[PDB]
Nucleic acid binder design. Structure first.
Lengths: 16, 91, 92
DNA sequence: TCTTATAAATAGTT
DNA sequence: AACTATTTATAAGA
């Protein structure tokens, strides 16, 4: 939610 | 409840918060029961009217989100409109 | 229900599938009501015991997940253990 | 799938 | 915060 590597993985999936 | 209510936005700020707290817990309790009865993993994300975040996960939110991203097959996917449609049909 | 059940894993494959289907819908119905009554945006992700995916979102799953990732503040965060704790504390 | 007897959640009042 | 009468959900049956 705030920060992280999970935050990163989720964001990318959503954006591609 | 003492009365049937219409499913429509509650405008009374106070009634809204009371309903929100009780029904949020009710939703999480039913999630808990489903996860145990049927051996499954559940995550729930809620943004209230003020855009504050509440979350529930039967075990670990990270793992469910990670698994979610890995899924590519088609799957059941519903919205409020599907649910409303179902309730039309149930009568 | 016609008889009271205890909250524990259902062993009969068939009963499990039947109960899953009915309770999943019941969960989504309650999410629908909360989101309308209280003006909430809600997403629900369920993996069954075989790891098949079922999802619900009041309006749009993408938007809620995107908002989740953006969120910076600490917030209420519960697991099964929190729920069980609440039930040990409640009398009703 | 439905239905219906019963259990569980909740509205309204306190 | 509590209680309780009622609405709603659902377990076992059709």
């Amino acid at each position: 939610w705030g920060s992280g590597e999970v935050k990163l993985r989720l964001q990318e999936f959503l954006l591609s | 409840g003492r009365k049937k209510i219409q499913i429509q936005r509650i405008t009374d700020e106070r009634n809204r918060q009371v309903t929100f707290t009780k029904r949020k817990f009710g939703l999480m309790k039913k999630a808990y029961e489903l996860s145990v009865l049927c051996d499954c993993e559940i995550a729930l994300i809620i943004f209230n009217h003020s855009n504050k975040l509440f979350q529930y996960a039967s075990t670990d939110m990270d793992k469910v989100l990670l698994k979610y991203t890995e899924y590519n097959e088609p799957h059941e996917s519903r919205t409020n409109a599907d649910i409303i449609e179902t309730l039309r049909k149930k009568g």
